[PDB]
Amino acid sequence: MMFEHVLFLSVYLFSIGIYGLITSRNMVRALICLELILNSINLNLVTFSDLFDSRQLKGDIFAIFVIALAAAEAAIGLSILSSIHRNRKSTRINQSNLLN
Amino acid sequence: EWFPGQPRPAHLDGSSPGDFGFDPLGLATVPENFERFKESEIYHCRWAMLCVPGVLVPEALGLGNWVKAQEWAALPDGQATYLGNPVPWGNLPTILAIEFLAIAFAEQQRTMEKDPEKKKYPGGAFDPLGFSKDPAKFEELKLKEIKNGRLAMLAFVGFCVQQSAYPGTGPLENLATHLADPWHNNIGDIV
Amino acid sequence: ARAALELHRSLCPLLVSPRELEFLQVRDPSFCSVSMVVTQIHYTARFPDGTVFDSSYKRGRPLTMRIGAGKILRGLQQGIGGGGGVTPMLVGGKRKLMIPPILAYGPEPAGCFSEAVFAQAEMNFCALAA
Amino acid sequence: PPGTVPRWGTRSYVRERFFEPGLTTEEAAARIRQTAEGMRTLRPMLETMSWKYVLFYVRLKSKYLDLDLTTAMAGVPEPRRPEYVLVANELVDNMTEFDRFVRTPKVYESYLYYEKTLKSLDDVAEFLG
Amino acid sequence: NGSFIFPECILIFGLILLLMIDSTSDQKDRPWFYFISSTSLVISITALLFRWREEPIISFSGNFQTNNFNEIFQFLILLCSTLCIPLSVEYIECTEMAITEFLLFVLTATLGGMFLCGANDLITIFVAPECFSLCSYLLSGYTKRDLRSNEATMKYLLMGGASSSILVHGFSWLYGSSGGEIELQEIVNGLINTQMYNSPGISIALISITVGLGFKLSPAPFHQWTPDVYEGSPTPVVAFLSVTSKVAASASATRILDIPFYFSSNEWHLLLEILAILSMILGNLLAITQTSMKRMLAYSSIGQIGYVIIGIIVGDSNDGYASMITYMLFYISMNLGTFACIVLFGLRTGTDNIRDYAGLYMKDPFLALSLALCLLSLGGLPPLAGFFGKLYLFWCGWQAGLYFLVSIGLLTSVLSIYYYLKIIKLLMTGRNQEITPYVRNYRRSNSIELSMTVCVIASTIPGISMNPILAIAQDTLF
Amino acid sequence: LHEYDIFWTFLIIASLIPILAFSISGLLAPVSEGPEKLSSYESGIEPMGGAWVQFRIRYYMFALVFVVFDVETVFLYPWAMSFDVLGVSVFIEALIFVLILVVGLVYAWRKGALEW
Amino acid sequence: FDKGVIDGITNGVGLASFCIGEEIKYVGGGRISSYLFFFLCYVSVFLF
Amino acid sequence: MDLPGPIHEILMLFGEFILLLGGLGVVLLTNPIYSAFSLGLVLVCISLFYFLLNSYFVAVAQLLIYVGAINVLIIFAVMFVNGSEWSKDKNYWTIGDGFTSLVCITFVFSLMTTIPDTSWYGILWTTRSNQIVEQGLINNVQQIGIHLATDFYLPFELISIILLVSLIGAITMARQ
Numbered sequence A: 001m002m003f004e005h006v007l008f009l010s011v012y013l014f015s016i017g018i019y020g021l022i023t024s025r026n027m028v029r030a031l032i033c034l035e036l037i038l039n040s041i042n043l044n045l046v047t048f049s050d051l052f053d054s055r056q057l058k059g060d061i062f063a064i065f066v067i068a069l070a071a072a073e074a075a076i077g078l079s080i081l082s083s084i085h086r087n088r089k090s091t092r093i094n095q096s097n098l099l100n
Numbered sequence B: 001e002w003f004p005g006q007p008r009p010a011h012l013d014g015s016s017p018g019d020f021g022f023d024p025l026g027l028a029t030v031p032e033n034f035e036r037f038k039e040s041e042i043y044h045c046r047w048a049m050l051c052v053p054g055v056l057v058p059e060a061l062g063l064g065n066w067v068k069a070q071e072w073a074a075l076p077d078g079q080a081t082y083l084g085n086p087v088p089w090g091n092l093p094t095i096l097a098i099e100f101l102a103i104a105f106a107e108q109q110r111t112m113e114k115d116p117e118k119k120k121y122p123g124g125a126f127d128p129l130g131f132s133k134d135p136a137k138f139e140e141l142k143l144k145e146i147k148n149g150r151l152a153m154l155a156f157v158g159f160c161v162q163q164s165a166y167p168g169t170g171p172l173e174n175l176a177t178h179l180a181d182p183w184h185n186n187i188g189d190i191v
Numbered sequence C: 001a002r003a004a005l006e007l008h009r010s011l012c013p014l015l016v017s018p019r020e021l022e023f024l025q026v027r028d029p030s031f032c033s034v035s036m037v038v039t040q041i042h043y044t045a046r047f048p049d050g051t052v053f054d055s056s057y058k059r060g061r062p063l064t065m066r067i068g069a070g071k072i073l074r075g076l077q078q079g080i081g082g083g084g085g086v087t088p089m090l091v092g093g094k095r096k097l098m099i100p101p102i103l104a105y106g107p108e109p110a111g112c113f114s115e116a117v118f119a120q121a122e123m124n125f126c127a128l129a130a
Numbered sequence D: 001p002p003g004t005v006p007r008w009g010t011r012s013y014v015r016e017r018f019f020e021p022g023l024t025t026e027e028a029a030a031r032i033r034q035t036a037e038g039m040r041t042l043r044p045m046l047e048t049m050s051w052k053y054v055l056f057y058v059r060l061k062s063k064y065l066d067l068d069l070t071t072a073m074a075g076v077p078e079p080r081r082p083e084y085v086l087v088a089n090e091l092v093d094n095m096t097e098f099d100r101f102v103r104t105p106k107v108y109e110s111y112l113y114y115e116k117t118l119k120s121l122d123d124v125a126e127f128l129g
Numbered sequence E: 001n002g003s004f005i006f007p008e009c010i011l012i013f014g015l016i017l018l019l020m021i022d023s024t025s026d027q028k029d030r031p032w033f034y035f036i037s038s039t040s041l042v043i044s045i046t047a048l049l050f051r052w053r054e055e056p057i058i059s060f061s062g063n064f065q066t067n068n069f070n071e072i073f074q075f076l077i078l079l080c081s082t083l084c085i086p087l088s089v090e091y092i093e094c095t096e097m098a099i100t101e102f103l104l105f106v107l108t109a110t111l112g113g114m115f116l117c118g119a120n121d122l123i124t125i126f127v128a129p130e131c132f133s134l135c136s137y138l139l140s141g142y143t144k145r146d147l148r149s150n151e152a153t154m155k156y157l158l159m160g161g162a163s164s165s166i167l168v169h170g171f172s173w174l175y176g177s178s179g180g181e182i183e184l185q186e187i188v189n190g191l192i193n194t195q196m197y198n199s200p201g202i203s204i205a206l207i208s209i210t211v212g213l214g215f216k217l218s219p220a221p222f223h224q225w226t227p228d229v230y231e232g233s234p235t236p237v238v239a240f241l242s243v244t245s246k247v248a249a250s251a252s253a254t255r256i257l258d259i260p261f262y263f264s265s266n267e268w269h270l271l272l273e274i275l276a277i278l279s280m281i282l283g284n285l286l287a288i289t290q291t292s293m294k295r296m297l298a299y300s301s302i303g304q305i306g307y308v309i310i311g312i313i314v315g316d317s318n319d320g321y322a323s324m325i326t327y328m329l330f331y332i333s334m335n336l337g338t339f340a341c342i343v344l345f346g347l348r349t350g351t352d353n354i355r356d357y358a359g360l361y362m363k364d365p366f367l368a369l370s371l372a373l374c375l376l377s378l379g380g381l382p383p384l385a386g387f388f389g390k391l392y393l394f395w396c397g398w399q400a401g402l403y404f405l406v407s408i409g410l411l412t413s414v415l416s417i418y419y420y421l422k423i424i425k426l427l428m429t430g431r432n433q434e435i436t437p438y439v440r441n442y443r444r445s446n447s448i449e450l451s452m453t454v455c456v457i458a459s460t461i462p463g464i465s466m467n468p469i470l471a472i473a474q475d476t477l478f
Numbered sequence F: 001l002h003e004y005d006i007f008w009t010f011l012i013i014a015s016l017i018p019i020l021a022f023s024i025s026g027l028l029a030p031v032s033e034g035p036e037k038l039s040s041y042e043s044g045i046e047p048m049g050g051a052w053v054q055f056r057i058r059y060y061m062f063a064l065v066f067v068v069f070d071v072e073t074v075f076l077y078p079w080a081m082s083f084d085v086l087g088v089s090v091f092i093e094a095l096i097f098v099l100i101l102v103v104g105l106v107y108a109w110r111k112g113a114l115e116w
Numbered sequence G: 001f002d003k004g005v006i007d008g009i010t011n012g013v014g015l016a017s018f019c020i021g022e023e024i025k026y027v028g029g030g031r032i033s034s035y036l037f038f039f040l041c042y043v044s045v046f047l048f
Numbered sequence H: 001m002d003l004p005g006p007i008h009e010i011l012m013l014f015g016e017f018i019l020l021l022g023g024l025g026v027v028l029l030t031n032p033i034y035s036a037f038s039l040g041l042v043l044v045c046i047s048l049f050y051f052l053l054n055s056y057f058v059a060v061a062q063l064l065i066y067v068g069a070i071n072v073l074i075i076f077a078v079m080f081v082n083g084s085e086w087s088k089d090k091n092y093w094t095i096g097d098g099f100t101s102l103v104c105i106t107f108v109f110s111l112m113t114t115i116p117d118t119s120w121y122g123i124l125w126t127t128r129s130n131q132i133v134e135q136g137l138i139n140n141v142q143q144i145g146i147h148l149a150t151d152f153y154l155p156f157e158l159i160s161i162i163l164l165v166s167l168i169g170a171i172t173m174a175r176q
């Protein structure tokens, strides 16, 4: 059930990754769930590049690039978090709607 | 209230789970009649909730419907099939005898206790975890049971009537039938 | 799913020449060969007797593939780029093929809740480069 | 030369064998004979060391021929069929060892069994039909 | 070992120089790099001038692209950046923020957009949208002491992460169902030798791609993120986004939807239509009720105007792409003009809301005139350019059968005339006791003047001189 | 790259090791210590209360520059493995790669980021 | 039956927009969670 | 290379059941530090999923770049969000909880019924030439090693400037 049971867990993570995103209240939790979604897509990707495409790996390289960009985004978002917590002394996300 | 705008029949002042002012025939005038009705109600609820998925899920598999699953007993040499497998004791007098002694004895064990509250909510060995810990939650726990149980009974009525209207049918088979053309497959076509 | 409708002709060929591996047949060689590079052909695939299950004309631009690196049916890559004992098809050439079931998908179908190709089939092609 | 009969592929191995319950006698007689001309196509893929399909195909064709051989053999000529059961032992131990000699990839034993695994399977299906 | 990146290698050289000068030089930079970056941009434009009338030759190991149509957009993004930088110099100058890394960010985002215009690789066309988005949450929030500039970083980063996520998940579904393939051209083969094309699957990897595409160029059902960010970020980066993001997204969309999606036409032609019919409606109604200038521009010039561009992508038999190129060339100018005017007036006064533009015709008439011209052009009136843009967009798009999209377009254009004429009316006035003490103290009066005046006449002349532009735009096969 | 079965057995064994040690300690242990047990040590003051002890302002920059400069290595490893296998083009490519981040580190050094 | 009917119509065709704009403009309105919710609803329904 | 045998599905189900609880801990628990630690658990148990399938690099790297740098960075970040212990009891927040738990389940149902209709084990037979090459004699750190630089030249050349720009932006933003 290798090729079949893992994909059955991709969605069962991806979905959760979205839900925690929407119902998130603090910035760090939203970023965590974002990273979780990216890892879900990564996992949905890799298995495809193990059943087939073994002559020239086309998924593992793409997985590497996805992880690199995930790290970059997780750096930039937290950097923005620093400045927002500097401006206002609380990072409650859903209590800032002064741009509407 | 069930019918917003009518006064409560004096003998329905909450004081019970799943009680919304509905006693048009005054069946519950006598408190003794009142209490026994609660027993039959929860039981008719309790059995029904078990029976509905047991009617449906087999149809959701290759197994026959709730009507076909009783048919081998009609023929004299009937042998059952559980999950398609011909269980040896599937002959009618076999299961009937097993059914009779077990059903009567356990149901007689009911008839020989009079709390009478436990006759609705025994718990204990019937509550291996003890959800009854929070009396607030347990009281709402009855509500969920009552409303779901009442929901089950209606679904049971729908299943049976759809069978008389459509002999040899399945509730999911009926559901899909409507699902083809909802506007030309309805309860409109019966009468 | 399974077969659908179409309509066309075939420009009846000569007798096929199997050449020990497949079924080869030539209709019109015109201009020039093609190396191990991207090509752009137009196909119309049949079943063994009569049926047609796809045709590049049933869409827009005829599809583009790679002739020289294994990315297609071995039968085609043998009968378009030129196999052992067979001359390759020119730029504007036109050939006809009958693919045996060993140089094809083989004895198992491609299912999608209904196999889109009969299990252990052997199909036909009318391949025209472009 | 018309089309053929798919005959119950169609699933994702969680629909089949778990959720679409059905297997009739003489229908497993199709799977059994199919994994004979089926498993006789890995010879080129054993020539070149493609150690990644010679495992997936073997696992699938086994888990398919590890239930049919128990259903089909019930439906062969039952008066005289101890041999039709005295073959499943071989036709499912040769493969159980084939699956060993691919896990830690060998060549000599792998190919020495990739002939003595099909040589038997042409005899299990033989007692069927 | 290849000159097809040299148009971008020059940009990389300029990037490295801009990063170096701050490391080495002390203080001689402020007006120096202001033109040193323009040197790199104009040199890249000259380099792209060479490859006019070229071959469809494939890239490094067949990675990004090199044909005529893609080269058009590759030059167009450079044009946008060249016009935009002089705006986003003096603005951030008058905020006492570091200017070096701002120009570095703008340059790197332009580089990402340029690489995106090709990218027939399924991976490059994924990193490049990130190279364009990772350099976007920075600019769109690069005023830290402000408060709104943080809201328009939260509700831009979260959204642009979720959307790129959905897009890459669609990409993974495609890579799976396609038997394993990345090269954009080589999918309809590989999706056939693997016979799983007509099956469910592909139907999912089409929607999970189209949604991530839409978010990047914001049609109606996903427009939610645009009105906020465009108000929260500084006006120059608003203009930069609202031009180059749309150009790059519309350049990537046509290629990602036409090359690997031959078969699914009748199932995405409809889909995009559902977006367009909404994009040109919900992006206009709200535009009426606005009182802020940047937010009204977000609604009108983007929420809507990203409608009739698409209005031919659905109706395209390669006889229309010329009209998309022409309309993009018109829209870039007719949008950068009004953004230049808005930046100039806002800096000179210090307000954004509409109710302060009163009387501006009397104090300084040149700016009022050069803003009214661009606004009317956006309205699409006959002698201007937007009229001929919308016209040739409809005349090829009514010539392709579909009727219930041109009528809606004309109707919503008539509707859009309203707020344009509203602000125009607010310009021309002389009721001295009405004008607020904002235009009353306006010392009227290089770079921004030059940009505004050379960008506004290109909003009136090409609409009448579209003959050579049309003759040029017809040679696009991609 | 032949048999990681030893790896899997070592994983399960060394993951059972800590819970095994904890359980073995728990079996032969004292059911005692109902004392205060609500205060940790090296604080003979019986103190309690306090928060907002972060100083994340300094160490956060270190964490960020590390997170960014780390990705270099997992890209260098496929290159560091494929030097002689391929020609010398990968040499120049990886030189450009590493030099980009050398310039980045020079920048992070000049402008005050790596501090006390 | 001129001001009250056809003038009424030619204004209500230009007045109903003034109401619909501000009406649909006051749903959501910030609260990024609501943005993502309304962004997921359309993605989900479009799968049909 | 290959796997032991019928021990495979055991580890498969074990890791799946661990990862489900991990995700539920990520999304349910209110204390953010517990959430981050459960996220780390999720990521190590998915690195083990990557390692089970015979893809070695994309497993160990994923373990180094995420279970390391990113998690410690997030731990440092949670030292800046003060105020926890919000409401509880069955969708603590507003009805938005129910609306999400509805639409997400619709999304699930859609994809989770789309998947078990594609014969993956039949989509593997149609490609018997892709994973049939192995280049002749290679191991799986050289496969990636070369095929990253022989045809994936442009994105590898690109990612570096993305990293540099992200570094510069992060330092310029986080610093007051």
Ligand SMILES: CCCCCCCCCCCCCCCC(=O)OC[C@H](COP(=O)(O)OC[C@@H](O)CO)OC(=O)CCCCCCCCCCCCCCC
Pocket (backbone or CB within 6 Å): B146, B147, B148, B150, B151
């Ligand atoms: C045959 C010709 C066609 C006519 C078909 C019937 C037409 C009328 C159907 C509408 C009835 C609505 C009753 C609402 C009554 C209603 O459902 O209240 C709503 C109730 C949920 O109420 P709550 O507890 O949530 O109340 C709190 C809030 O909802 C505020 O009230 O649902 C239940 O009662 C579940 C318990 C099972 C009991 C369900 C009762 C259903 C009764 C319907 C029986 C009709 C039989 C007719 C047979 C012919």
Ligand SMILES: CC1=C[C@H](O)CC(C)(C)[C@H]1/C=C/C(C)=C/C=C/C(C)=C/C=C/C=C(C)/C=C/C=C(C)/C=C/C1=C(C)C[C@H](O)CC1(C)C
Pocket (backbone or CB within 6 Å): B049, B050, B052, B126, B127, B128, B129, B130, B131, B148, B149, B151, B152, B155, B158, B159, B171, B172, B174, B175, B176
């Ligand atoms: C007591 C106790 C104690 C301890 O402590 C713990 C424990 C153990 C946990 C517990 C137990 C519990 C239980 C057993 C429960 C059960 C329940 C149920 C079964 C319910 C149902 C319930 C059920 C229900 C509601 C149902 C419903 C149904 C319905 C609506 C249906 C509908 C339909 C459809 C769709 C369609 C078609 O065409 C028709 C019809 C058919 C009409």
